[PDB]
Symmetry: D2
Subunit: 498 residues, 4 copies
Amino acid sequence: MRTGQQYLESLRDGRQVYVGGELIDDVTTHPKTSGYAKAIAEYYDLHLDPEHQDVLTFVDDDGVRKSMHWFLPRSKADAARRRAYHEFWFRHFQGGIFTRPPAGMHVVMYAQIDDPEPWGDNAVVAGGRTISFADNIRSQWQRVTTDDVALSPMFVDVQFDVETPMLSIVEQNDQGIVVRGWKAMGTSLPFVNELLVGNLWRPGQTSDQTVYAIVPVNTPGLSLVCRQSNATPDADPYDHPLSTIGDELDGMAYFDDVFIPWENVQHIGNPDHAKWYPQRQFDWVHIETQIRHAVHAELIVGLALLLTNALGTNNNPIVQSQLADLVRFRETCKAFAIAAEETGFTTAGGLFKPNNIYVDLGRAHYLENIHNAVNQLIEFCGRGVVMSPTKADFDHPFLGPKLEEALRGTSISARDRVSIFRQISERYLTQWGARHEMFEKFNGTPLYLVRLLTMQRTEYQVDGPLTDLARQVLGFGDTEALAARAAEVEKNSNWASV
Amino acid sequence: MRTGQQYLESLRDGRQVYVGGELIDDVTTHPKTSGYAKAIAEYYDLHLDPEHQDVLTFVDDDGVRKSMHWFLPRSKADAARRRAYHEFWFRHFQGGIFTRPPAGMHVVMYAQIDDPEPWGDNAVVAGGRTISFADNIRSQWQRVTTDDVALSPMFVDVQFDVETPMLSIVEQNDQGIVVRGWKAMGTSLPFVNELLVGNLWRPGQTSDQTVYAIVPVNTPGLSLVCRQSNATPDADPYDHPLSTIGDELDGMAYFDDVFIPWENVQHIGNPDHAKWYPQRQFDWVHIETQIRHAVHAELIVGLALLLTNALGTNNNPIVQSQLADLVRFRETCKAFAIAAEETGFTTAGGLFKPNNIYVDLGRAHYLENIHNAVNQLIEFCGRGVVMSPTKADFDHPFLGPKLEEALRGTSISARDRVSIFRQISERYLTQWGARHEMFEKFNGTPLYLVRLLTMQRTEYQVDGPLTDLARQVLGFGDTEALAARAAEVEKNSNWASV
Amino acid sequence: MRTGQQYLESLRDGRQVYVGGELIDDVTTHPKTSGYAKAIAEYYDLHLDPEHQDVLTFVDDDGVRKSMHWFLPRSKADAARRRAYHEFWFRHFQGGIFTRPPAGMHVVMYAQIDDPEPWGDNAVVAGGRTISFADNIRSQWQRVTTDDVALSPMFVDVQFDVETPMLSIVEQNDQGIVVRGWKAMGTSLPFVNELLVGNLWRPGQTSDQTVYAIVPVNTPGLSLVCRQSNATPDADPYDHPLSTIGDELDGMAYFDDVFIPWENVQHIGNPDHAKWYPQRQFDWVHIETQIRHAVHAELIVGLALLLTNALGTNNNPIVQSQLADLVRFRETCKAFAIAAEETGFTTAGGLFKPNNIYVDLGRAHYLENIHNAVNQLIEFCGRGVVMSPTKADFDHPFLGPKLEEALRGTSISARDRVSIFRQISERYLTQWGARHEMFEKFNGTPLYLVRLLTMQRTEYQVDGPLTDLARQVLGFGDTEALAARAAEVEKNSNWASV
Amino acid sequence: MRTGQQYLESLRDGRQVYVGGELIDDVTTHPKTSGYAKAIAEYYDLHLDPEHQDVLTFVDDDGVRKSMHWFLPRSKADAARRRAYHEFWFRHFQGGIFTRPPAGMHVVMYAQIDDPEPWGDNAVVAGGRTISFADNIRSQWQRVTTDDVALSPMFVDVQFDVETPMLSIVEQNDQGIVVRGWKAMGTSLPFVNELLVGNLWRPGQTSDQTVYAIVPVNTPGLSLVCRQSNATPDADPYDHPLSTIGDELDGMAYFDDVFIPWENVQHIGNPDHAKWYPQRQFDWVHIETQIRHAVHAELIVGLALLLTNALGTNNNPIVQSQLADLVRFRETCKAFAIAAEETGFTTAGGLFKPNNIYVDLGRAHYLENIHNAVNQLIEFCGRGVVMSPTKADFDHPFLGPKLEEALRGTSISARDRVSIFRQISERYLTQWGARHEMFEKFNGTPLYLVRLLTMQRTEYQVDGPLTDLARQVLGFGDTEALAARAAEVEKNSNWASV
């Protein structure tokens, strides 16, 4: 279990990190990145606080105490403990402003370690070499959980439509592989130690494009190309209460003939393996993302009750009625999380997996409606979000006291009530805040794909059990049985169109 | 455990029943009512079928085997058995076309028998008489569960705004009470044996208007004034597959100086008792209604998959996408039911009550959206629901075979595919079917009131725990603590407006 | 200008009319059909009422006075007179309960007579015969406007996917053509004199399936196969105020070797002619349908204000707020109609055509939202639409006066207020009424196709003018100009993927 | 007609301007304000460009050529010219990024000069002084149109609930009045020459709080307290194409014993005058705001077609279908503007006023839906709006060319396609852009008030003409006539509740 300071020092390691185009020599001290790095350092210190040992840690099999971000659940009760762990962090991060602490990221490994042998059995290797990919996965899992390494996944590929820009193998040899190209998008890249590189199957994916591998962030040839930082380390925290903490950067990564030793490769070369195994990995991101959805909706409804109360509008029945739908928004997200847990079941390896049907459709409920919930919260604000005094306006020796007189409420000071506006403006009306909404839109399986995937499930086919009730009501057999009676009506008849 | 024939005979009892204005001398043989009465007779026979003993019956404490419509649940597992019981009936009734079999109606008593003493303690009696209302409730519960009586609630009052038309006590004496006035609305009235009369508190309710009592349907002075029947006993069942079964009538009831003996009175005269106890009774109607919502959404999505497949439109991506939202509609209802059960807890009397927060908001999710789900299913039909051949058209010696040629599908006959249209038309485009949609709209706490009630709950007050997360993010105390700091800013200052 | 009685007599003509499978010997006297036939008879008498001469008639070129259902508009002011004509009829029919009086149906001819020569020039004829199709159209138009014939279109085909069941030519000779097969759907078929047969292009349509022709309803071999009637000639009009008037039947038509003389053929045999000319005909149905949409929304909002006022709920702010959106629904429909008229322009033949962009998208606004407007109106009703006394209940000597006491409002009697419920139930909760909603859904270009058609218009292409503003903001050329700069960046560079 | 340079110099005038708390000594040179000031300078130069004389100017009555922002329309054709004038500016400002150039602001005066005498007749003056308020208005209008002064309205008051913080008269004398307090919100304050101070009636408004007056921005005692600037004068315009132009600041204004001479007062002291006259002034802001709505929706749909085409998603039918609804969104806004113009009518003074019913409800259509249109456009972007390379990333000597390879499209370069993302991010995902969306939400009569106002109109009362159609269908008199028949049913009867 690492300390914050050990975490911070692990980042000072030669990594090539671009932020808005600017090379960052030291992510732990640069103004664009240091607030977030410090926030993850604090994340690590808290795991060592005895007061939080129950929620944040577990004593594993060999008696060692490890952080719950390494905990594989074996039961419904274990899953519920992981839920409270995720909830701890979403609340600690003020509703979930940072979505990818290690607790959100390391979950992508749980399905690999649970069932490593297919990763090797399906694997695709040149020159008759024999690589022990399942051993590799088991070795990596023991290394990262023993050294408390921080890992971030990079699975999404650039949408190229004869060497593509996508990451691909350009050489295989006795020591390992060389890869060249881009990974399209990952999160917290400058703030972890190693990447979990992978693929989700897309049409046309070749063997040389199928690579799953652990690769350190400071490996020769790897460049992190991150979005500009929206952190405001020097702003007054009354004016910007959240961007002054830091910014969880997102970015791409370019691999300039990166060498990967075989011990770090988990699978190469089988596109079909990309078709079902990485989705079992992201089921676990979806689970924790779906829990965070409920917390965010909780923060929205609470802001809304405090805000409407502060403005004396909470007794308007239209307002009362919209608050009630915000409450329902929150409880819908919560209900899907409970349903997913309660109808979960154990994998062959013994991993208790929440039901992803309820996870994915709970996420769809959030994805479809969150921008309406946010729009409703903003609507409650009125003008305050077009203009609200800064702390400097309130501090002006003459105009300041007059602001505090003119903007106070019945039972709330001007500074406190404006601080409600500025909290809502930070999250939903700034570049800093808009990234949070965009990340939740586009990271994970997005709404349009949840829809398509849903309809490919076995449970929801025309012949699946979901049409049993309607077949009974209509007096039908299955598809094949209806088709048979149509054919005999044609066969038993005199028609010009058959 | 009564037989169907004993049930049917119990109805031939002198009751005064008006259906569309027509006096019905025998509800078991009249064409307007006999289909439904026969459907409840079958409901009773099935409880005696050994094949369904596990789901439909229980062996109670004294070793007697009784129908589950008398089963008080003591645990989460008991609640789950009641759920499967309700589900049995919604599926047997083809998705829930009849909403108030005895299994749906008798649940209003579970909270009375669980906690009868307040009904007497709060009670409101004249002339220094002493009535053992809690004994009365315990006696009634033993009578109705031993004789398998069929009961329907009448709680809703006419919305009068110096003797009102609402039911009220006009005399109290040693034998019992005399009541006079209307009950506004009940269901299955001509098809039960006794009414469960009651009140939900409204502003202005007087003592003499607060009456809770068992009263037999054939009591002197009681008139059932029911809506016209939409049953079609003589239609061809291919043309009208559901109205040919029967019609679950709804109606009002007028009490022309009805005498009620004290042994049948459960509480009189305390308006405040109407404020919280009857809502604990209807929590149990809401529970089963909320389960039925999921079944109905299951029937809708199944009809939609069969229908779009029958029309060759199921591969259009827009259609695929709308089917997926119908699937999600169904799973949202299901998830709220599971969440309500799992977060349930036991009353002081030992009754395991599902969490009504999830029940009520699951109902709100249905109530807000069902007419969009139905509208989507209808949209999938196209023209078929403006005109589709009757069975007589298909049977015409010359035009019939031509209809079967012109309207067949790839892998489905004309008759079978048109039978999909006519199933959807029955439920959603007829008087017979529209009653089902209207009943689900308006019976139970309707959407606008679920909203208002929600916001009166303790969990959702400005100072409740739902604003804890947002208070933490803002750095606030509770309402009283914010008010205090506002006051000192005023107090510590120089303003012209204070 | 025919009389009602001449109209009624024109229907007693040997026609083969099936209604719910039942052969109707005389549509003017049979209970299933006579109410509607009488309603169209009254439609004709009113054109002769001097009081309505201004709105209902015009004095054409040769000095003859004709009904406006034959009026070709030549100007924006003429179009506005046609609008008031359509509005007269939608208001006379109580908001539009019958959608296809002759005024709604004959409009499909306006674009043919305006531009007849392409109908012949494109035409497709066998055996080197020469048919004067444009002469035929001009002759037909003079016949039908001089004899005041009633015409209904049949354009929709059965969706067959080696002689198909669709109508097609099976012989061509010196006298005319023989056709065999179905037309899928028309309206008012038993109540007009001749059909306007036609096609809208679908993929796979053959030459022998492309037929445009006037054919009398009593032609040998033609069978009208209509939906069951929902008319209730014997119901009490207080209980059913609209189905007691009659039912505008919809149906199919089978052609059993129907002979059509050349003088009645307008075009045969060119599928491509079906691709753009019939849509110019239905532009005129869309125009009047779009005006009716506004009237229907007017009737809905008026019912809603009267109803909420009758229930004392009109001052609830939530109700006030929903009434306001119903008002906006009505004014949106109206605004699209005004915009279509004002931006109209004249055809080459001199016909002033309202802008169909605003017509079609005004229709889309109605089609997307009407079932929400109706659902809101129903929600305002409460329980009254589950049960409301019939006139017989109110007339009962003992219970009747008690109903009138219990159901009266502050300032409105029980009978009058229940008559609001029963008006809403007729239109939106019965088989009779549901047909109106279904007809408006599915007749005309439906919403999903309005969407697709919209995006095929020239105005809305990627290179059309609708992207001019955004091209200017981005600093782009047209598609071809952007493509050119992409190519040179590739060409001027060193890449592995080009 | 002023030049840009005369405009810029008029601003260097001693004004007290706070921007984010910082005193701005010269708004024409400070980085926070100079971009916008220069944009209005260009606005003025363009009026003098002969090429734009037709659209931008008019030759008034005395032969003088003036800018159209002073043009009072006298006809439907004049109104259409003003529409094209507003449209010119919304397109010049890239869809309307700046909402309050002088053309948007000076319109608040048109209704005063049209009908000045009530402003004096209603006026409320102390000490028996006689002030010629109508003369004052006529004098001011001649001064501002002759000197081309720039004016911004300040009408909104702080929501104080014994001297309030709201602006109010604290002295009246022979020279004029002294006012003290806040105005709550105005736009472009640092960039105009004089304020148009006024009030909209709120409950409790006193006589001393009713002040309408022209007051120069550099008057002794006036402080402009503006929101922080989101301008980015030093950013690369490829990264931020709109915030590099400037920022139209919004703010409050404090009056520290400001003296106003009588010649600048237009009305004081009659709260009732605030009830209907200022709404006639803002009708003209609403008109131009409503036109801008259509332009913005045009820019959104154009961005969306270019974007989906650039991503190869424009042929997905779901996408095609959502583009079509964006097109409809644009045409709905346009249709309401056309309807408002065409049904306009002339005031008593001769001013042709577009119909505000269609203006306000067209605005409501925008206000209710714009955040869904924006959310749809963002959804089309995918990941590109979480991260897209800056110009520095693209310029990197090694990673740059690789970015251009990996992010290019079929027929569009990487730089051009990313420039689509960054245009959408500027407008809808930054502080700079969010102000535009917030201004359109909250400035003007907002949606919830449009609803309430709508229902107070005469046209939409229970007894108004909108219920005529439904009264006819039901067979009712007016409210008074129904009430009469209810009373006689009570009177002619035997009831216990009357």
